[PDB]
Design a protein around this ligand. Sequence first.
Ligand code: CLA
Ligand code: CLA
Ligand code: CLA
Ligand SMILES: CCCCCCCCCCCCCCCC(=O)OC[C@H](COP(=O)(O)OC[C@@H](O)CO)OC(=O)CCCCCCCCCCCCCCC
Ligand SMILES: CC1=C(/C=C/C(C)=C/C=C/C(C)=C/C=C/C=C(C)/C=C/C=C(C)/C=C/C2=C(C)CCCC2(C)C)C(C)(C)CCC1
Ligand SMILES: CC1=C(/C=C/C(C)=C/C=C/C(C)=C/C=C/C=C(C)/C=C/C=C(C)/C=C/C2=C(C)CCCC2(C)C)C(C)(C)CCC1
Ligand SMILES: CCCCCCCCCCCCO[C@@H]1O[C@H](CO)[C@@H](O[C@H]2O[C@H](CO)[C@@H](O)[C@H](O)[C@H]2O)[C@H](O)[C@H]1O
Ligand SMILES: CCCCCCCCCCCCO[C@@H]1O[C@H](CO)[C@@H](O[C@H]2O[C@H](CO)[C@@H](O)[C@H](O)[C@H]2O)[C@H](O)[C@H]1O
Ligand SMILES: CCCCCCCCCCCCO[C@@H]1O[C@H](CO)[C@@H](O[C@H]2O[C@H](CO)[C@@H](O)[C@H](O)[C@H]2O)[C@H](O)[C@H]1O
Ligand code: OEX
Ligand SMILES: [Cl-]
Ligand SMILES: [Fe+2]
Ligand SMILES: [Mg+2]
Lengths: 63, 34, 33, 33, 334, 81, 34, 36, 30, 30, 38, 37, 37, 341, 36
Amino acid sequence: ARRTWLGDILRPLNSEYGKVAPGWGTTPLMAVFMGLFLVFLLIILEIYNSTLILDGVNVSWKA
Amino acid sequence: DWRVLVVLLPVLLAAGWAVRNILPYAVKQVQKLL
Amino acid sequence: MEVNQLGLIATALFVLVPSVFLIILYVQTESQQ
Amino acid sequence: MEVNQLGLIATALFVLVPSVFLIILYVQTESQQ
Amino acid sequence: ANLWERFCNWVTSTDNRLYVGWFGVIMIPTLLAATICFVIAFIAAPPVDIDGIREPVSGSLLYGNNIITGAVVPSSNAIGLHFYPIWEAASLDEWLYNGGPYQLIIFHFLLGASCYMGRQWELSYRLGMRPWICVAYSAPLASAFAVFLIYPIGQGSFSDGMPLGISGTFNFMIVFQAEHNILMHPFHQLGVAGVFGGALFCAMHGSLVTSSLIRETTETESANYGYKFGQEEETYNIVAAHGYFGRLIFQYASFNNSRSLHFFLAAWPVVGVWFAALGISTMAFNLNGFNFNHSVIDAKGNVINTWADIINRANLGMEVMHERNAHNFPLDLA
Amino acid sequence: TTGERPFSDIITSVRYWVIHSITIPALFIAGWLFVSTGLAYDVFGTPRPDSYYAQEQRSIPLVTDRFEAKQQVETFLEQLK
Amino acid sequence: SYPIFTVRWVAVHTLAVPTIFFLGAIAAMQFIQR
Amino acid sequence: METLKITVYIVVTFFVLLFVFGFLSGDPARNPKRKD
Amino acid sequence: METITYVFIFACIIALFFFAIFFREPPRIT
Amino acid sequence: METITYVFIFACIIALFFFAIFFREPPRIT
Amino acid sequence: TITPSLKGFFIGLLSGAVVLGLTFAVLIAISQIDKVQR
Amino acid sequence: MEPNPNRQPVELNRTSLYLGLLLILVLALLFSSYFFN
Amino acid sequence: MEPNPNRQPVELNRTSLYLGLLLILVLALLFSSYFFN
Amino acid sequence: RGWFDILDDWLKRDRFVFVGWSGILLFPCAYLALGGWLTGTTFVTSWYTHGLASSYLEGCNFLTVAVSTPANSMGHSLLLLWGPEAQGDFTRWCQLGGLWTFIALHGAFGLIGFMLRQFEIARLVGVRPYNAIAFSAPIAVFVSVFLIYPLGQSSWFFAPSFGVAAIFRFLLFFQGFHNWTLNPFHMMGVAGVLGGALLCAIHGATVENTLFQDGEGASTFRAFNPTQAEETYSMVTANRFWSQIFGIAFSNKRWLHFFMLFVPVTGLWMSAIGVVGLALNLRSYDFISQEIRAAEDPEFETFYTKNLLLNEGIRAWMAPQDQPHENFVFPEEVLPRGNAL
Amino acid sequence: GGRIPLWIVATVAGMGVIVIVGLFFYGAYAGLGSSL
Ligand code: CLA
Ligand code: CLA
Ligand code: CLA
Ligand SMILES: CCCCCCCCCCCCCCCC(=O)OC[C@H](COP(=O)(O)OC[C@@H](O)CO)OC(=O)CCCCCCCCCCCCCCC
Ligand SMILES: CC1=C(/C=C/C(C)=C/C=C/C(C)=C/C=C/C=C(C)/C=C/C=C(C)/C=C/C2=C(C)CCCC2(C)C)C(C)(C)CCC1
Ligand SMILES: CC1=C(/C=C/C(C)=C/C=C/C(C)=C/C=C/C=C(C)/C=C/C=C(C)/C=C/C2=C(C)CCCC2(C)C)C(C)(C)CCC1
Ligand SMILES: CCCCCCCCCCCCO[C@@H]1O[C@H](CO)[C@@H](O[C@H]2O[C@H](CO)[C@@H](O)[C@H](O)[C@H]2O)[C@H](O)[C@H]1O
Ligand SMILES: CCCCCCCCCCCCO[C@@H]1O[C@H](CO)[C@@H](O[C@H]2O[C@H](CO)[C@@H](O)[C@H](O)[C@H]2O)[C@H](O)[C@H]1O
Ligand SMILES: CCCCCCCCCCCCO[C@@H]1O[C@H](CO)[C@@H](O[C@H]2O[C@H](CO)[C@@H](O)[C@H](O)[C@H]2O)[C@H](O)[C@H]1O
Ligand code: OEX
Ligand SMILES: [Cl-]
Ligand SMILES: [Fe+2]
Ligand SMILES: [Mg+2]
């Protein structure tokens, strides 16, 4: 296949195909961030929904 | 409120009746399970 | 009747464009070995 | 401008009809053995 | 062989590309008559005085309609159940004004579609098949008889038959609900179960068979080339499909007999559509859907509205507005 | 064939019917009493037939205010007296 | 030799228990007057 | 109108008679199995 | 134009019926 | 519509130039 | 400040954590007791 | 330059032609009224 | 029934495609003003 | 052998009701949506949200009970039990229509749980996932009708209420307000549903009537064995039959069964797209050209024009009681009526 | 295991369903929801 100048520069970034961390790896950390993201999305959903009403947050054009 | 007991009267009294007619065999199931 | 001025071209292309697509694929299939 | 109401469809078909005819014949030629 | 024996062998020949048969000798002229007249009427028929009130309704394309609004309008209310063929009219222009084409189309159609059912029996007999495809077809056939013939008979006029068009169909449906509360009739409800269930079961059976197709092809080709027409082997693993669907629900909920499964696929929409047809055909005699208007009364006697009461308001709105110039007396009796 | 006892073996056994000739009526009777003591009305807030309207009221107690709907219902209920 | 309490037993009684209770409630409703 | 009435009556009678006589013409024996 | 358009599309459908019936790919037993 | 039509046909011609030049059938010496 | 709907939000967050938490403790526990025979 | 080995022949059988044309013409017949409006 | 021996394959090479398309587009560009008028 | 793998072992055990990981989502959500519906229709009123009786406890029957939508004044509030509207009071939550959102939200997550179950079981037994793919259509219908439609509208009030007659009101509302029968997306839906029931009827009947004689009984169900390799019915005879009756016939069993997936699934997807339009009132209400003509020519009448008058009757006669938040007083002289009736 | 015949169980349970639905049909004509 054709070597090019830019291709030889970018070569290390396409060199670890199929490479993995053993076992569960960082899965428990990922799950925690997913849990926090779910809570974050619930919070902003409930603010837009007026289910969560906070001081200083008038969800309206008049704000 | 006296009416929660009356509704829970036949529920409680028949749960206790079925846990008596099944207790010699609910024991045997959980024992071999251990 | 006072119809949409683009209704004729919209209908004609809605027919003709995918119909010719299918005809192209049919005809070149028949010509394969 | 106040143009002929059929000029768009007349032009669109004058393009599309023989163009697709040529495309059909081209594509089925390429697919021959 | 004489000419009659040769003709009979042609008529009943299984080698004809389309099977004629004895039902076919009725079906073919009748259906061609109904089709030709329908196509000409739908394109070009002048407006028809459907309600008998000198208020002609425009149904054809040339008279301002599109595909959606166009229809062959039912014959005039002044005609009622009277037979109105071309020869009974003083001219074609009068026949057209009074809705002659409708009677011609539906009569040829119903005769023709009845013979389509007979023709399905006939060919199955000639081919050595079991004979009951025609029984399945009797469901939509009965439905067509219900809306084109039985409903007009019980109501006393072919003007109450369903129009031959798309918006005309919707008008028929809305007025029917106004006058009969068809949604609250259990036969219609069984019809719905027949058709939703039928579409459900169609999706289910299609999906389970497709899911269990046995690999005979690669990724670059349609899996449909894995089946050869008239191959002896089964093309899907029915044990795998049963093993899936009996774990999706539970084991005894799932068919493992393909013959039972296919009978169920026949029987469910067919029995449901039979109930739908009987629904229409019994509302033809004004035995209506359930009336719960003011069924719920408080301790004083105040009416407490339910959802059925909200349906009644909608029903009233269609009723007071339908055929808005045809009624002269307070009760809509037929 | 998943190892559970067959249902037709269970419901034809006498031990099942010793148990269920007590538990099935007791549940049915417990449901009967939930209505006939009137507890069903007080748990769910469903009006009794004499509590839809005040005595000369014709209007519906419809909820019109989102964040004070809980109070609108309570004011409607306190007008039933 | 079979067990008594299973995931199946639980699934049956999560439906059958409230069902019989609700059937008694609705039966009693047949004898409410206005 | 009278000529149209007679024409339809003739045509209809013709096809009805084909149907009736055709089903009378040993129809059960036209089957692939028992040609009795 | 409208009426012509609807009749045209309809007529093409009838023609397609003709080809789909009389010029189908013949089912071959293999 | 007119202006769009003229520019469209023109733009197709320019595209056809591109294919006729850069994606021609290559002249092969035989 | 903590508004009532915010405390209500924390109630629903805690109640979901308790439902999912007690479900997953029970599922883990039964799974540990009733292992598959390999 | 070597030719591309990922290339694949494309097919559409006659029944697929008839089905597709049926689909396109019926959608045309259905939507035409709405396009004219 | 035996197939018809008069049948012949039809061809249009790529240059013929490009020439024909050029022809059709230029005739379109030429006549479009007259069709709009 | 970690705790995950042992939990995976237990969840995927062969049992009478398969559980799975999807069953953690499916089984509570389905049970609550089902149980919420029965609870609401047995015991819960709609008196404060709609001014309706909607329970067996109030005298309704199976056709007329419903769990009705919340009041229009609630907007699109999630109406959580702990939310700012009910404030934790279960009795008030039932009175404000919180059971509607409870059923809708748990029904939604249960439907997800059910499609996840379809994937999980298909993956475990080793079949392709077309049943899950076909289930996308009822999900698309549920999401468009029960969620997207009211979200486009003013509130959850205008969603369908979960009841037989309540749904019938939803049908007649869509005629009178949206002219939904005129909508080409609904028409595609009707074709898929009716075409689906036709294929169901015809395929079942075709198989049953082209069966091979595989046994001596006149009742022919016993002649099937699931371990047979041979086709139980004659595709060749079925093909010849339908080619001669109808002109065309299936000749590929795989395409036949795919088409049976495709037809009702495509139809339901098409109707869902129409309902999304109706969320924004983007109706196919009228044909502009006919309205121009009917306005200027008082003799032009079609079935479409007649239907518009029916629709005007529906709106006027139903709106005061169907939308009690509006406080419509329509005096008798403003209601459209024809002569006599 | 096989004490009570399943046909007896089926018959009594089938008749229990009839009585309960028949009561609900009786309640359509009496009391609440009867329109009286
Ligand atoms: C299969 C052929 C066939 C049949 C059955 C029909 C049937 C009909 N035509 Mg059509 N028609 C046909 C072909 C046919 N047509 C053709 C080819 C044309 C073009 C020429 C037409 C043109 C046409 C027009 C223009 C009109 C009709 C009309 C009619 C209707 C009334 C006819 C009538 O009054 O006859 C009278 C009946 C007889 C003379 C019956 C004699 C039959 C035998 C001898 C007696 C047995 C009767 C008894 C019922 C037994 C039946 C057998 C049974 C046991 C199986 C009737 C539905 C009219 C209509 O549609 O009105 C709304 C009408 O205006 N037809
Ligand atoms: C798979 C099971 C499942 C799912 C997906 C749902 C989903 C839902 N339920 Mg249902 N519910 C369930 C089972 C389920 N439920 C069961 C078994 C019961 C009976 C006990 C209920 C009883 C119930 C009631 C009575 C109500 C609901 C409601 C709801 C809705 C809102 C829930 C919410 O906002 O909590 C938010 C919490 C979470 C989303 C938890 C997420 C986990 C996070 C990411 C982990 C971190 C949390 C953290 C540890 C908490 C610490 C807080 C601390 C800082 C103070 C939502 C649709 C409400 C509703 O329907 O409104 C109309 C409602 O009123 N549920
Ligand atoms: C020929 C007559 C006809 C036919 C065949 C249809 C067909 C359809 N209509 Mg239409 N309709 C018609 C006439 C017709 N309609 C007329 C004249 C009107 C008046 C304008 C309407 C008004 C109308 C409205 C308002 C709506 C429809 C909708 C639909 C679609 C419903 C799809 C569906 O299955 O929903 C059924 C629901 C689902 C598939 C969701 C999934 C259901 C879950 C999986 C069930 C779970 C059950 C659970 C396991 C157990 C439950 C407990 C049990 C006790 C019940 C379908 C295309 C709907 C639509 O377009 O939606 C996109 C819709 O909202 N129609
Ligand atoms: C023999 C099967 C014939 C195929 C039938 C095809 C049509 C099936 C019709 C529908 C069901 C008909 C009645 C049973 C058809 C029938 O043949 O039944 C027979 C079947 C088996 O009975 P036994 O358990 O005695 O038999 C066990 C056998 O193994 C004998 O050893 O009975 C049932 O399974 C009872 C069902 C109670 C169901 C328990 C419900 C628990 C809730 C589960 C719901 C959760 C799953 C939902 C997932 C989302
Ligand atoms: C909501 C809620 C909840 C839940 C609850 C539940 C879960 C419930 C359940 C419930 C249920 C679970 C119920 C049941 C019911 C049932 C019933 C009521 C039944 C009935 C039946 C009958 C009536 C029968 C009839 C019939 C049919 C259907 C068909 C065939 C024929 C016959 C006739 C047999 C909770 C607390 C968590 C939370 C809060 C809220
Ligand atoms: C099994 C089964 C079931 C069930 C069913 C049932 C529930 C039934 C019942 C049945 C019944 C329960 C029957 C009965 C019968 C009766 C009879 C048949 C009677 C008769 C009588 C008589 C005839 C009379 C006479 C007289 C007179 C007339 C006068 C006076 C004197 C005297 C009384 C003698 C089911 C479906 C679940 C499933 C399958 C199986
Ligand atoms: C709206 C405008 C649309 C206009 C449509 C124009 C349609 C034009 C039709 C062109 C038809 C070409 O017709 C097609 O010709 C090719 C060869 O050329 C034939 O193909 C045949 O020859 C080729 C080459 O020898 C073989 O590889 C092939 O196996 C064999 O079948 C097809 O069997 C025939 O179907
Ligand atoms: C206005 C709407 C117009 C839309 C136009 C749609 C254009 C569609 C383009 C279809 C192109 C098909 O593309 C064509 O595929 C065929 C096979 O399928 C290839 O053909 C190749 O395979 C076949 C079969 O193995 C061999 O016989 C042939 O010799 C070889 O070249 C052609 O080399 C390629 O050019
Ligand atoms: C509706 C008005 C007419 C009413 C008719 C009732 C009259 C009763 C007697 C009619 C006689 C029918 O008699 C029937 O005639 C036909 C044709 O002539 C005979 O002849 C037939 O022979 C064999 C079958 O047998 C066929 O393959 C052949 O094509 C046919 O000619 C039948 O074998 C005989 O059964
Ligand atoms: O045409 Mn047709 O719709 Ca049967 O009800 Mn009376 O008549 Mn008329 O008003 Mn209503
Ligand atoms: Cl009308
Ligand atoms: Fe099948
Ligand atoms: Mg009562």
